[PDB]
């Protein structure tokens, strides 16, 4: 029959979708929510065979294990075994658009369980399979006769297996089709794989059982008083002896119970539900759940009969919250949200999209850790247990159906035609009957990038009239469809329209008031985390901050979806698009995250901390003001720690009780500071710290910080008078400088300096010179290729214009001798193909005291594309062990990405001035230096630089990390000016005007000494 | 004490190159022993007879923002011309110069002189490459007015009919000038982007006779 192959099968012998079960028959184990004994998992040792297509199954592996299996674990995706490739792509679907068709080559797998099952759970009762995710499509036997048939990847499928199965052993097969018809609902940007790749486990229920319950709490005007309410409904046979408790606890202690025979109130002309009773539980003072505060109850049911003989129980926590929308904002328990929100995909680099609870909870700590409040399951339901962790460490989650058309052309296709109704409804149907009861789910999403359909206005309409609790949101169609209660755009800017036909992605700030609209802007997804990336992120949360009806965002991605591949020694490497024989692939497009696949930070994701901060500050004479943007809790875990420091220098310090309310404000008078002995910048750095661990923090930890100058007092005195005179010896081919033991070598040919020398040691392996280019970001990048070249680009502007090709010509190179010092003069032209691209007009001056000041002046011609840098590199001959500067850190920062770092006396290990981004590029910049020392030498002034072993162009020449072989010596890059990365998104140029090098002349000065 | 800050000298040299004369300078402006700026020039005196200056200035960090940060002296020569190639015809400041061409602009010395009815520092032309008054030459890339009034007597005369013309003509040439705002007229009302914050300035300007 090809199911297939059919979107009007999406299912065959399925059981209802419900929250999760687990047929409790003692009551304490369900309040407490131990393991039950009804509820065992099959996962662990299977067996595996692959086949090209459903048609090369043998009917022997029906009844018979096949001898040329494998024995693997499940759950699992069999790419991760290596039976065949796992592809990237991202819109174009990895097969034939052709629906709803599949490729007759169709990898399946077939799956094999021999496994027990006592008598005990067959002479009563039901027992049902369930397979938390099977991608894409399957069919099951149990003992040789066919079961059923289930699709949608994300959600679980469960059958009654009753009436197949024998004490003893018993077998299960499963044949998983790689390409279904679901397969177009399917069409997310992510590795495409397949197999049995979450739990699998087998349940017992008695006949007469709770087959569901909905938990609903509804508030009074100020919160003090709340009803829980619980609608239960059973299957099996109707007796009036038969009855429903559901009691409310609270840790320990019992809040409320209540006990009803079923019965529900009239509906209808034909009566009520006779199988179905609601109850209804006051509570007084609810402790009110938050991502702030995520108190939980505990509601337990428990079916029994009159003379109180436990038949089963199930249970779940509850979080006594509100969400509404309402006057245009989004308001939790009456206060309006500021989401702090991030996108996540599951995947791990070892075993593809396969779930553990260690993973989750290393996620969810370093989320809250970063000031993330919200998540959004992009782009499907997620594995049962991210919810409960969600529910109990405090996060708020937009759940989304698993339903992606992005591939389609137009992207409505599907979604604006009946006939794929049925499919679509299942999969946003079953995820609300699943997940409904979970405090942490505050917004339900209609999927993703499927354009906005008839289809998505049906299923709208559905959801709200089932669950009144929860906003609907929906992307498709231009964010601010008739589908959606939140406009919800992606990749909109903060300030500078997009006007798209069709769908424009207009300015945040002008969205929210073009005309005739009220609702609140969330952005579902924004800055792009593409490699070195999160430029301009300060700009948004400004917005957020200044504008009630911008609630925040969720960032563009938690995770590089990274694969590990081993090379030909056996040593891992991470690999990304194409790196499978995947063809066609989007190449690098699968790492988007804040966080590489092994949860290691990139650097950007400090930034997202600071601008994610719960305390804002001002400063105003002596006083700090801090204000608390906690909505519901005080500031009972928080002191505030102040340090003023001169050039790096600390000078005084203290700390602080903080005791904010929600929204409040506390002053903080600083003590009279003591003046400072020499001159240079005072600055102010405050931190806050908790005292006390958490559960997702330890004790120490720092939540929030911010830095200003104070006095400045401007070095006036004069450098005592040296005792000697450089001495200046000029020949045809150099201007040669010595003073004591240094040695300065200006090529006169070239024009730069080409060696310098202390004692016998040569300090140089490439003279320095001017550059203006960079290794390419992936945001210069965007969507160029070498078959399809994007003239936009960043990289393409500056390729074209000849900025990596301009070779130097020498305009001027003359040495003079001064009272105390030797003068150098140099002007180059930097050409190509007859145009003037850049002018450096440099002088040089070594002086008494040993110290060369270079004073550079560029012009750039303001017809070419504005330059990545201007600034000077050379390869220096020494490799050190330490890098100490004086500037902004400790971490990677750009022009557009600088807020998080702090002015102050850094020192790290020279591989932390190197940032292993998967695809390489310019990297480890720190900005506002005003002192850097590196072996013997020091550079001051007021510039940018990167040091590391890899120079620009091994950078821009190689396209994975793990290729990149350290250089002789030490690379270093100073720059007085570098161009923004941007990051808005990462397929069209996003550095905003203010951070382009446009100013067409350019004046910076460095002093370089000995140290 | 902007207006009464003190220019203490902090060196002044003088080299002979092979082809020009090199003079450098540095000031620290005081006041109350506190430093608000200090400027380092070279004066490069060619066989051309030309002056370049080169200015680099530092600015306390927590002192209010500087109005300008330029040059000004009081040339003995009045001349009825004023040309020169930069954004005009009109005066126009940095936050309002949206209208101003940039052209060769060629008016009569009063036209670059605004008649407030209250004096004020008026007439300023921004993004000018050269200038041009009498036998004088100025190039670089600066802002400058040029006036028969001193900033002092613009500064202490209340009505424009009170105003007197001095000797010479009082130039001001500025690498940076600040924003003038007007917003509102009670409040500053200049924007962030417009007031001199940068803490270290540069510019560059030759003198010669045309
Ligand atoms: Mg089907
Ligand atoms: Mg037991
Ligand atoms: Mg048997
Ligand atoms: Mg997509
Ligand atoms: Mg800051
Ligand atoms: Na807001
Ligand atoms: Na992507
Ligand atoms: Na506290
Ligand atoms: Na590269
Ligand atoms: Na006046």
Redesign the interface.
């Known amino acids: 029959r090809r199911d297939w192959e059919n979107p009007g099968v999406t299912q065959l012998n399925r059981l209802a979708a419900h929250p999760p079960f687990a047929s409790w028959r003692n009551s304490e184990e369900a309040r407490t929510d131990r393991p039950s004994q009804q509820l065992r998992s099959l996962n662990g040792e299977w067996r595996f065979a692959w086949f090209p297509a459903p048609e090369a199954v043998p009917e022997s592996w029906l009844e018979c294990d096949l001898p040329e299996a494998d024995t693997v674990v499940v759950p699992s995706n069999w790419q991760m075994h290596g039976y065949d490739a796992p592809i990237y792509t991202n819109v174009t679907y990895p097969i034939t658009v052709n629906p709803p068709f599949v490729p007759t080559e169709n990898p399946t797998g077939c799956y094999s369980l021999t496994f027990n099952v006592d008598e005990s759970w067959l002479q009563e009762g039901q027992t049902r399979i369930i397979f938390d995710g099977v991608n894409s499509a399957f069919h099951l036997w149990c003992n040789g006769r066919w079961v059923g048939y289930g699709q949608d990847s994300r959600l679980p499928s469960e059958f009654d297996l009753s009436a197949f199965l024998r004490a003893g052993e018993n077998r299960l097969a499963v044949m998983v089709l790689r390409w279904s018809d679901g397969s177009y609902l399917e069409d997310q940007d992510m590795w495409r794989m397949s197999g049995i790749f979450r739990d699998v486990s087998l349940l017992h229920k008695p006949t007469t059982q709770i087959s569901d319950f909905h938990v609903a709490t509804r508030f009074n005007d100020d919160f003090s008083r709340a009803v829980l309410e619980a609608e239960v409904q059973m299957c099996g046979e109707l007796r009036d002896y038969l009855r429903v408790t559901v009691s409310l606890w609270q840790g320990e202690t019992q809040v409320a119970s209540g006990t009803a025979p079923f019965g529900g109130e009239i509906i209808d002309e034909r009566g009520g539900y006779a199988d179905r009773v609601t109850l209804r539980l006051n509570v007084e003072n609810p402790k009110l759940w938050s991502a702030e505060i995520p108190n939980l109850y505990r509601a337990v049911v428990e079916l029994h009969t009159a003379d109180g003989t436990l038949i089963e129980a199930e249970a779940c926590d509850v979080g006594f919250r509100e969400v509404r929308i309402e006057n245009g904002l989004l308001l939790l328990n009456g206060k309006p949200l500021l989401i702090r929100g991030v996108n996540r995909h599951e995947h791990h680099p070892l075993h593809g999209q396969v779930m553990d609870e260690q993973t989750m909870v290393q996620d969810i700590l370093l989320m809250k850790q970063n000031n993330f409040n919200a998540v959004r399951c992009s782009h499907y339901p997620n594995h049962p247990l991210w919810y409960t962790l969600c529910d109990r460490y405090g996060l708020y989650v937009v759940d989304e159906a698993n339903i992606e058309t992005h591939g389609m052309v137009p992207m409505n296709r599907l979604t604006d035609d009946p006939r794929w109704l049925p499919a679509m409804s299942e999969r946003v149907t079953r995820m609300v009957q699943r997940d409904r009861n979970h405090p942490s789910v505050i917004i339900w999403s209609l999927g993703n990038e499927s354009g906005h359909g008839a289809n998505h206005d049906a299923l709208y309409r559905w959801i709200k009239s089932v669950d009144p609790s929860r906003p609907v949101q929906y992307e498709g169609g231009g964010a601010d469809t008739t589908a959606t209660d939140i406009i919800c755009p992606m990749y909109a800017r903060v300030d500078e329209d997009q006007p798209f036909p069709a769908v424009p992605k207009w300015s945040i700030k002008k969205w929210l008031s073009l005309p005739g609209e009220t609702r609140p802007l969330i952005l579902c997804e924004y800055a792009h985390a593409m490699g070195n990336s999160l430029g301009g992120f300060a700009k948004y949360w400004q917005a957020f901050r200044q504008y009630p009806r911008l609630q925040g965002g969720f960032v563009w991605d938690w995770v590089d979806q990274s694969l590990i591949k081993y090379d030909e020694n056996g040593n891992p490497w991470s690999a990304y698009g194409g790196d499978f024989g995947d063809t066609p692939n989007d190449r690098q497009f699968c790492m988007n995250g804040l966080v590489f696949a092994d949860r290691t930070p990139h650097p950007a994701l400090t930034e997202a901390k600071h601008q994610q901060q719960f305390f804002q500050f001002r400063l105003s004479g002596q006083t700090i003001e801090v204000t608390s943007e906690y909505l519901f809790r005080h500031s009972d875990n928080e002191l505030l720690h102040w340090m003023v420091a001169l050039d790096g220098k600390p000078l005084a310090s203290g700390e602080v009780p903080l005791d904010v309310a929600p929204q409040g404000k506390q002053l903080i008078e600083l003590p009279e500071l003591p003046q400072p002995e020499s001159a240079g910048?005072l600055w102010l750095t405050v931190r806050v710290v908790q005292p006390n661990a958490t559960a997702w923090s330890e004790a120490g930890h720092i939540s929030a910080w911010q830095q200003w100058?104070?006095?400045?007092?401007?070095s006036?005195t004069?450098p005592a008078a040296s005792h000697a005179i450089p001495h200046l010896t000029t020949s045809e081919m150099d201007f040669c400088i010595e003073l004591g033991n240094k040695r300065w070598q200006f090529n006169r040919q070239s024009g730069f300096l080409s060696q310098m020398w202390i004692g016998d040691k040569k300090q140089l392996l490439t003279p320095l010179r001017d550059q203006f280019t960079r290794a390419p970001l992936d945001n210069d990048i965007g969507v160029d290729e070498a078959t399809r070249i994007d003239p936009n680009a960043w990289v393409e502007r500056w390729k074209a214009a000849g900025h990596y090709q301009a070779e130097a010509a020498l305009l001027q190179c003359?040495a003079?001798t001064?009272?105390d010092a030797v003068?150098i003069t140099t002007a180059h032209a930097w050409q190509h193909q007859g145009k003037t691209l850049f002018i450096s007009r440099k002088t040089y001056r070594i002086d008494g005291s040993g110290q060369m000041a270079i004073t550079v002046?560029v012009e750039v011609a303001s017809d070419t594309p504005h330059p990545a840098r201007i600034g000077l590199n050379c390869q220096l001959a020494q490799v050190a062990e330490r890098v100490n500067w004086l500037g902004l850190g400790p971490q990677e920062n750009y022009p557009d990405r600088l807020t998080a770092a702090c002015f102050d006396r850094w020192d790290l290990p020279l591989s932390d001035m190197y940032t292993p981004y998967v695809f390489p590029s310019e990297n480890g910049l720190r900005c506002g230096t005003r002192e850097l020392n590196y072996g013997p030498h020091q550079w001051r002034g007021?510039f940018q630089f990167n040091i590391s072993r890899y120079s620009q162009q091994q950078l821009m020449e190689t396209s994975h990390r793990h290729l990149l072989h350290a250089e002789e010596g030490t690379w270093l890059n100073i720059d007085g000016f570098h161009m923004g990365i941007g990051g808005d998104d990462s397929w069209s140029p996003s550095v905003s005007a203010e951070f382009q090098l446009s100013a067409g002349?350019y004046?910076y000065?460095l002093v370089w000494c000995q140290k």
């Open positions: 910048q100058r104070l006095a400045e007092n401007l006036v004069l003359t003079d001064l009272a003068l002046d007021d002349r004046h000065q």
